[PDB]
Amino acid sequence: VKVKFVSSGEEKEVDTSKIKKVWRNLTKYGTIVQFTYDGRGYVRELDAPKELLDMLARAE
Amino acid sequence: AKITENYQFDSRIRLNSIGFIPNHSKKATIAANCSTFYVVKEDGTIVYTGTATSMFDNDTKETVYIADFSSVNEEGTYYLAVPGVGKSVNFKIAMNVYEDAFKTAMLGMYLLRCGTSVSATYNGIHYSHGPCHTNDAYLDYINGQHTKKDSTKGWHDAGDYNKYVVNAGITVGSMFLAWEHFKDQLEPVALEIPEKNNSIPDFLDELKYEIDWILTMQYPDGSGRVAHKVSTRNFGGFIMPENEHDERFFVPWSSAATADFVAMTAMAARIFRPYDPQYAEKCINAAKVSYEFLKNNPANVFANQSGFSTGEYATVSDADDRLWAAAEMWETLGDEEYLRDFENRAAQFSKKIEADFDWDNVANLGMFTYLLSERPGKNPALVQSIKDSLLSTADSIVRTSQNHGYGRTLGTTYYWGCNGTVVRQTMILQVANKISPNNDYVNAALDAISHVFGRNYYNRSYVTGLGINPPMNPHDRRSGADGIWEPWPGYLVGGGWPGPKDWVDIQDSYQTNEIAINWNAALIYALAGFVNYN
Ligand SMILES: [Ca+2]
Ligand SMILES: [Ca+2]
Ligand SMILES: [Ca+2]
Ligand SMILES: [Zn+2]
Numbered sequence: 001v002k003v004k005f006v007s008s009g010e011e012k013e014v015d016t017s018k019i020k021k022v023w024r025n026l027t028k029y030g031t032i033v034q035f036t037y038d039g040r041g042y043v044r045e046l047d048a049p050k051e052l053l054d055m056l057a058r059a060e
Numbered sequence: 061a062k063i064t065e066n067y068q069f070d071s072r073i074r075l076n077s078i079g080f081i082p083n084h085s086k087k088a089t090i091a092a093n094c095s096t097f098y099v100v101k102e103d104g105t106i107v108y109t110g111t112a113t114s115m116f117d118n119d120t121k122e123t124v125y126i127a128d129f130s131s132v133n134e135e136g137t138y139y140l141a142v143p144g145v146g147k148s149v150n151f152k153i154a155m156n157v158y159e160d161a162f163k164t165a166m167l168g169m170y171l172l173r174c175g176t177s178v179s180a181t182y183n184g185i186h187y188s189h190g191p192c193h194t195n196d197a198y199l200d201y202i203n204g205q206h207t208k209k210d211s212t213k214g215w216h217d218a219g220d221y222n223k224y225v226v227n228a229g230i231t232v233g234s235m236f237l238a239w240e241h242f243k244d245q246l247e248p249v250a251l252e253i254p255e256k257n258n259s260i261p262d263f264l265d266e267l268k269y270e271i272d273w274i275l276t277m278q279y280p281d282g283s284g285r286v287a288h289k290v291s292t293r294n295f296g297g298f299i300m301p302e303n304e305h306d307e308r309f310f311v312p313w314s315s316a317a318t319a320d321f322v323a324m325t326a327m328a329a330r331i332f333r334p335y336d337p338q339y340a341e342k343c344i345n346a347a348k349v350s351y352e353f354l355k356n357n358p359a360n361v362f363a364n365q366s367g368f369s370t371g372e373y374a375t376v377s378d379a380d381d382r383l384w385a386a387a388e389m390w391e392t393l394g395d396e397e398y399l400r401d402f403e404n405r406a407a408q409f410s411k412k413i414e415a416d417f418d419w420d421n422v423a424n425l426g427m428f429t430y431l432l433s434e435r436p437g438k439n440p441a442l443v444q445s446i447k448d449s450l451l452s453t454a455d456s457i458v459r460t461s462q463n464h465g466y467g468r469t470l471g472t473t474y475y476w477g478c479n480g481t482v483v484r485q486t487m488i489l490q491v492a493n494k495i496s497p498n499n500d501y502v503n504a505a506l507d508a509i510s511h512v513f514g515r516n517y518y519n520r521s522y523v524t525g526l527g528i529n530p531p532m533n534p535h536d537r538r539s540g541a542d543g544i545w546e547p548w549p550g551y552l553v554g555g556g557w558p559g560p561k562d563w564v565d566i567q568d569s570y571q572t573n574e575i576a577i578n579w580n581a582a583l584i585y586a587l588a589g590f591v592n593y594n
Contacts, residue, residue: 025475025476026374026375026376026420027476027477028218028227028371028372028373028476028477029371029372030372030374032475032476034475034558040558040559041558042558
């Protein structure tokens, strides 16, 4: 599936098949899911497709 | 011999724009092909000729050239001249080179005070505001009653004005550890604060203004639960704090806030006793009430704060917070019960010391207190396991900084607030150096400092009002709402992420360009070790 994310002021999309690393940060507001792909991006946890969240859980 | 060419500043020559200390490391990163370099006094006298060495900066994916001028050890003002490139900004070499920056970071804390007017003149610029948030705070969300219980004072947390216990935890803890670690260095220091003529060391006066607020956060029912924050319902706009009239509320308790409270107040009790013994007794009695609650209610509890839209600071676990609380109760009081709590908790950490830590993961503070205590009775094996983890982790930070093209202790890791962690890592390095003296640890601490003062990709200081091309546009309401071009001084901005080039110095970027008490506290600890230094 497609992960939509904003980078350098542009709406961008990446399919999770092309996503390499996935990990989390806790901010003062909630969780961010960072990733790399064949590029860097992030989404808020609540904006993440479950498939990305599955990948995070496996990496963890 | 004097330089014979006229050198112009070149932004590819990146170094600590404050300067350097005799007998410590001094490096520049030159993001340009070069070889020879000179260190030059202001009149053009050459004091050193060297050869820069190539290194791949894996972080930015480019080769940089490292100019190592550590052997220059005569106090003065200098610049680096690099044939084919240009010159650096001027810098100082001096034993006291960081004292002004320390005092400026402390000024930032003063200027964050809530419940009072503040005023300071910095670089000829008068920063001020009138008394704010003098009606803190109402109990409706705690007990249903529109009753005010005094919750004034403390520091505004960040670019907003709300006050959060969990973030106060790492902030106050790190600053109290600067005091304990560096007491003889900090106790004589005078600051630009209203309490400059009292009988209390000025560093501690600033902390007392925060502890005065923390002490108000226990529930009025006497249970020992600690409210998570004092907040407006929603974020206010870019207005001066004295113009924010919306009601502020105590927010329902969390177990982490409660544990952080115990740690902070137990530290305050031992720290303030020489100076304000009645206050010290108040602090320890309050710590005991909340510790007893924690003993009787072991579960992790998140604050019920979804009726608010301000900072959450919802640490995922309180296990680290409870470990820290036990350590501090033990160090202040010495009772076997507190030691036993601490040791039982600590022995279960698989990794005793973590390199990357902040408000969510405060166990390192308790590990530090435990390890450095002079009290008898510690389990020898647990001491050794913590010690080994400390030294292993410090050694890893040294390697990371040596292998990074800009000396960044945190390597290639970037996230919201990561600039604070870069300097917070100086705690690990300085505690390691107390346990096992090693100049590499101290030099790595100075690499962290140098990184936030201009030895970085951007060639910029990350601290408002200091060094080369500092941040001008923090996500900071006072700075945005006042009549002054330069932002309020002395604040370490949070930093860019996800990448090493992603900082944007624009007011809208709360993600990369906010301020925060926990970031300033880390900077304060880092600089404190170099105040009144030998
Ligand atoms: Ca004083
Ligand atoms: Ca925690
Ligand atoms: Ca302004
Ligand atoms: Zn205020």
